[PDB]
Amino acid sequence: IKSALLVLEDGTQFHGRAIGATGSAVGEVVFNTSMTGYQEILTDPSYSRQIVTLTYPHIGNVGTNDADEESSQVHAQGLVIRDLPLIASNFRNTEDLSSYLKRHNIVAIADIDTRKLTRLLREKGAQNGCIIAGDNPDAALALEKARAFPGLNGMDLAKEVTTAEAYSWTQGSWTLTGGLPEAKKEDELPFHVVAYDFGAKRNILRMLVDRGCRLTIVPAQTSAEDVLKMNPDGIFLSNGPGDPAPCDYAITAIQKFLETDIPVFGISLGHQLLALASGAKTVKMKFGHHGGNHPVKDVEKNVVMITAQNHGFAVDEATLPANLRVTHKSLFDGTLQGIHRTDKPAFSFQGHPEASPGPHDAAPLFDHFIELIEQYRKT
């Protein structure tokens, strides 16, 4: 028998089985409703310091593989599931879930009532928690660790996951037939985009490459001055963990960009960051949006899109500057989902146009960003 235990800040206990590394894990606890894409989810840097509970009972049905990694490592702090399948069954698999977790040194627990946990988080709101996996899991210790967690509000995590030094990205999207492409050649990409790495997902980069952008991935703290020096065709603000709020450096730099005519586009954290620099305020949601079936209306066109969501903070629509027009809203809760600067070539989306995992409905968000870029090169 391999025990494991999960304890919430409020004292709630969940007893299960250890399916990953031996040890302890602490972080904010969340639930994601994605029936597929667990690997992608686990490898999302945005999940840094969060303990991920999956609502879909059977997690690991397809094992894992490299192409399904959205970053170089597993960023989730811990994984909480209802059931770990006996086997992985998919031509794409290269290593079973449990093995993968152990490899990445992830504390994970299975066999617990994830529905009870979900309903609790929904009703009471997010909560920090601690998973302990080992011979005899100390429930009082776990509760200690959880209660001591500083929490995500006001925590800059973007500076934690970002890249140390700048680098290039010219690799495109995966294909069933060919797999993951060989990185393009610089001369094979018309546009040059500078992307701020706030803990950026690979799919965003790949997709941008798919649309003809050669990329320069820059550390979160990179000054606007340094960027501007590279003569960007466009500036992109990646997704990532924590509160956008405390990221002074980014906001500052962005404001700078906003003085210029360089097109700016941001996704999730980048949306937030954009809104902040534009003088809007960001709030911490009760429980957030974590899943792949979230309806978002494009208010302009009056069309709905099924989207992939992964965020705990939002832009207050009621503090939006007049220079910030609303472009999309959640059909689930009415929360702000998109904005466009009425006076600048800058826009952002709260959701994940790049999906991975999730529906491709929002990818056209990218196209607009290309538009701007094309136009900008016109001038």
Ligand X SMILES: NC(=O)CC[C@H](N)C(=O)O
* Residue numbers at the binding site for Cl ion (CB under 5 A): 14, 112-113
Nearer to ligand X, 154 or 178 (CB): 154
Give the whole-angstrom CA distance, residue 11 versus residue 129. 9
Nearer to another protein, 51 or 273 (CB): 51
Nearer to ligand X, 63 or 312 (CB): 312
Give the whole-angstrom CA distance, residue 20 versus residue 100. 8
Q: 3-class DSSP state for residue 4?
A: strand
Nearest residue to 128 via CA among 152, 112, 111:
152
Beta-bridge partner residues of 353: none
Give the whole-angstrom CA distance, residue 187 versus residue 130. 49
Contact partner at residue 37 from Cl ion, K ion, another protein, none, CB < 5 to 8 Å by partner kind: another protein
Contact 155, 49 (CB under 8 A): yes
Nearer to ligand X, 150 or 179 (CB): 150
Angle between the 248-257 and 269-277 helix axes, to the nearest 10 degrees? 70
Neighbour tally for 148: CB within 10 Å: 12
Contact partner at residue 111 from K ion, ligand X, Cl ion, none, CB < 5 to 8 Å by partner kind: K ion
Contact partner at residue 242 from another protein, Cl ion, ligand X, none, CB < 5 to 8 Å by partner kind: ligand X
| Residues shown for the chain | 379
CB of 93 to ligand X, least distance (A): 27
Positions touching another protein (CB under 8 A) are 31, 33-37, 40, 55-58, 61-62, 65, 67-68, 82-83, 85-87, 89-92, 112-116, 118-119, 122-123, 174, 176, 291-295, 297, 302-304, 306, 331-332, 355-360
Among 49, 206, 311, 328, interactor with ligand X by CB under 6 A = 311
Contact code string over 94-133 relative to K ion, x by CB under 5 A = -----------------x----------------------
Contacts of 288 (CB under 8 A, 6+ apart): 30, 126, 309, 311, 312, 313
Using rule CB under 5 A, residue 139 touches K ion? no
Nearest residue to 320 via CA among 301, 336, 303:
336
CB of 12 to another protein, least distance (A): 10
Neighbour tally for 173: CB within 10 Å: 18
Neighbour tally for 77: CB within 10 Å: 22
Contact partner at residue 241 from K ion, ligand X, Cl ion, none, CB < 5 to 8 Å by partner kind: ligand X
Contact partner at residue 293 from another protein, ligand X, K ion, none, CB < 5 to 8 Å by partner kind: another protein
What is the residue type of 144? E
Contact partner at residue 240 from another protein, Cl ion, ligand X, none, CB < 5 to 8 Å by partner kind: ligand X
What is the residue type of 325? R
CB of 56 to ligand X, least distance (A): 19
Contact code string over 220-239 relative to ligand X, x by CB under 6 A = -------------------x
Residue whose CB is nearest to ligand X in the complex, by number: 239
- Per-residue CA distances from 63 to 59, 74, 274 (Å): 9, 15, 37
CB of 4 to Cl ion, least distance (A): 11
Give the whole-angstrom CA distance, residue 144 versus residue 75. 23
CB of 201 to ligand X, least distance (A): 8
- Which chain residues interact with K ion by CB under 5 A? 16, 111
